[PDB]
Amino acid sequence: SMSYSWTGALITPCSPEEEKLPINSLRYHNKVYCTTSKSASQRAKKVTFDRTQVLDAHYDSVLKDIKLAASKVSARLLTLEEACQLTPPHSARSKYGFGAKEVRSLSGRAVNHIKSVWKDLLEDPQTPIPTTIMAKNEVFCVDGGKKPARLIVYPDLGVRVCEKMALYDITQKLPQAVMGASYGFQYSPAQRVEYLLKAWAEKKDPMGFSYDTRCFDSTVTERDIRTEESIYQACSLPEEARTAIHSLTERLYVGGPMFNSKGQTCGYRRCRASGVLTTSMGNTITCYVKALAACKAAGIVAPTMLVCGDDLVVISESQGTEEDERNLRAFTEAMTRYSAPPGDPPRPEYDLELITSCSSNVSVALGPRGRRRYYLTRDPTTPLARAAWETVRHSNSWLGNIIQYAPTIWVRMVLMTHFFSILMVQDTLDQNLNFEMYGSVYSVNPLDLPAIIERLHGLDAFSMHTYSHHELTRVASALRKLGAPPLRVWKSRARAVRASLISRGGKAAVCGRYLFNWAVKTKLKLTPLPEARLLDLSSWFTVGAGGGDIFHSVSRARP
Ligand SMILES: CCN(c1cc2oc(-c3ccc(F)cc3)c(C(=O)NC)c2cc1-c1cccc(C(=O)NC2(c3ncccn3)CC2)c1)S(C)(=O)=O
Secondary structure (H helix, E strand, C coil), X not given: CECXXXXXXXXXXXXXXXXXXXXXXCCCCCCEXXXXXXXXXXXXHHHCCECCCCCCHHHHHHXXXXXXXXXXXXXXXXXXXXXXXXXXXXXXXXXXXXXXXXXXXXXXXXXXXXXXXXXXXXXXXXXXXXXXXXXXXXXXXXXXCCCCCCEEEECCHHHHHHHHHHHHHHHHHHHHHHHHHHEHHHCCHHHHHHHHHHHHHCCCCEEEEEECECXXXXXXXXXXXXXXXXXXXXXXXXXXXXXXXXXXXXXXXXXXXXXXXXXXXXXXXXXXXXXXXXXXXXXXXXXXXXXXXXXXXXXXXXXXXXXXXXXXXXXXXXXXXXXXXXXHHHHHHHHHHCCCCECCCCCCEXXXXXXXXXXXXXXXXXXXXXXXXXXXXXXXXXHHXXXXXXXXXXXXXXXHHHHHCCCXXXXXXXXXXXXXXXXXXXXXXXXXXXXXXXXXXXXXXHHHHHHHHHHHHCHHHHCCECCCHHHHHHHHHXXXXXXXXXHHHHHHHHHHHHHHHHHCCHHHHXXXXXXXXXXXXXXXXXXXXXXXXXXXXXXXXXXXHCCCCXXXXXXXXXX
C-alpha cells in the first residue's frame, strides 16, 4: 500500500519559524540555514510511495529464530510514576490541559487523564488514535540545494506515558535478547570501535558494507508492525501489558489519521510513526530480521552485523571481488523484496576505515605511548553549522556532539573551546543542561564531562595526537566553508579558556586540565578520574538513545 495518503491540508508550524539567522555573530548569516514547515510538502512527496513485500523461507526462518529468542524474555509493566519520570521536562504538552511539568510532578489532572487513557487502551482495541504531524526545524550549512524539513508523527502526551507503561521494560530487554552482539545501542563509542576492530580481525579476509535503506520509516509495512507485535507477545508478559500492546499496535503503530497543528485532517499513515516509543526498537529489530534474511538469501559468508535503527553494517568473509559484488547485488534484491530498497546501492569495502554508518567513520590517531588509537568521527560541517546558529541565537546539539565525538580534533579544539568560553561568559557553568537527541533528551552538567568522556571513550580521549591528514583536511574545509576561525586560532583561544577554568578551581579546574591538556606546552600526566568509575549511564546504551521520548540522566552507583 501507499506509505501515506494526503488530504491537501498543509503541515503547519506551532511556533513562529526562521529560515535564516536575523542580522541582529552576523558573520554566519549567509552560511547557515534552518529547515521550516515551508519545505514540508517537498518531504511529504519524498516519503510517500507504494510498498510491495514478498517474503521467503530465509525471512521465515530468521523470524522463527527471533521469536524463540524473545520467548526467553520476561518483562513487566512500569508503574504510572516510573513512566512519568521517564518523560522529558519539555516533551510536547497534551491537548488535554497539562504538559510534561504536570506529568513529572504527578499532578491530579495529568495522573487522572493518563489513567483513563490506559483504561481506554484496555477496553478498546480498534478506534484509531489521532497523531500530530510536524515539520522539524533543523540547521545545516549552505552548500546540492537546501534540504527539506524532516517530518515527525506523534500521539498525545497521555498516550506517550501509556506506551512507556506497556513497552518501556521490553525496549530495555528484548533487542539484546534477540540480536545479541548485533544490537548496536548497547555499546559506548569505545566499545563500538573495539567490536568493529575485533569483527574485522576475526575474518580470514574481511569485506564490509553499510546498507542505506531509502526512507526506512516509509518502507515499514503494516505486516512488519503486526510482526513486531507478535515478537513482543513472544515475551513472558503480564496480561494487562499484552492487552495494551495489542491495542497500541492496532490503534496507533500499524497506522492512523494525522492532523496538522491547527487540528485539520492532514493525512493517513500506513507505515512507521516517527514519534512513538517503538520506533527505534521496531526499526532495529525489523532492519535486523530483513538484513539477516537477506544475508542468507544472498549467500553472505560468516556475516557479523551491527544494527542501530535503520543503520546497518555487515562485515563478512570476502569471496573474491566479483563474487562480493554479485553477493551484494543479491543482498540488495532480497532487501528490496522485503520492502527495504536502498538509497544508494551498497559497495564492498576492504578497509574498515572506508565504511560510513550513522554518518560516522573509524579513524586512527596516536596515544600517549605512540600507539594507535581508533575512534569514531564524522564530517563536522552540520555540528559546526548548528553551533554557529545556537551561538548567534540562544543555547543543545553542541553538548550531544561533545559527548559522542569527544576524541575528535574538531570537538577538542573547536566545540569544547567555544562552548566552555560561552558557559563562563554566561556564568551558568555548574548547571545541568538538557539536550535533545533523536527524539530523546539527556540531562548533563558540563562540569561532569571529564568523567562522562572517560567512561564512554577512555582516558585516551584527552591525550590523542597525530590525527590523520584526511581528518585534518576535512575539519579545515568545514571551518573554511562556514567562514569560521581556522584551527591555528583555536589553540590560543583554548589556552585562555583553560586559564579561566583552572582559576575557578574545583570541577571547573578538572575540565580545564583534562579537556584542554592538548593546548599547553608542559603537558600534565592525566590519571584515571575516580568519578568515572561510579557513573551509572545504563539507559544511554539502549534503543532509548535513538528515540521514544525518553529522559536520560547521569546517575552515580555506590561501589
Ligand atoms: C551517533 C553517533 N555515534 C555512532 C557512531 C556509529 O558508527 C557506526 C559505524 C561506523 C562505521 C562502521 F564501519 C560501522 C559502524 C555505528 C553503528 O553502530 N552502525 C551500525 C554508530 C552508532 C553510533 C550511535 C548511534 C545511536 C546512538 C549512539 C549513542 O547513544 N551515542 C552516545 C550518546 N549519544 C547521545 C547522548 C549521549 N551519549 C555516546 C553514547 C551512538 S557515536 C560517535 O556517538 O558512537
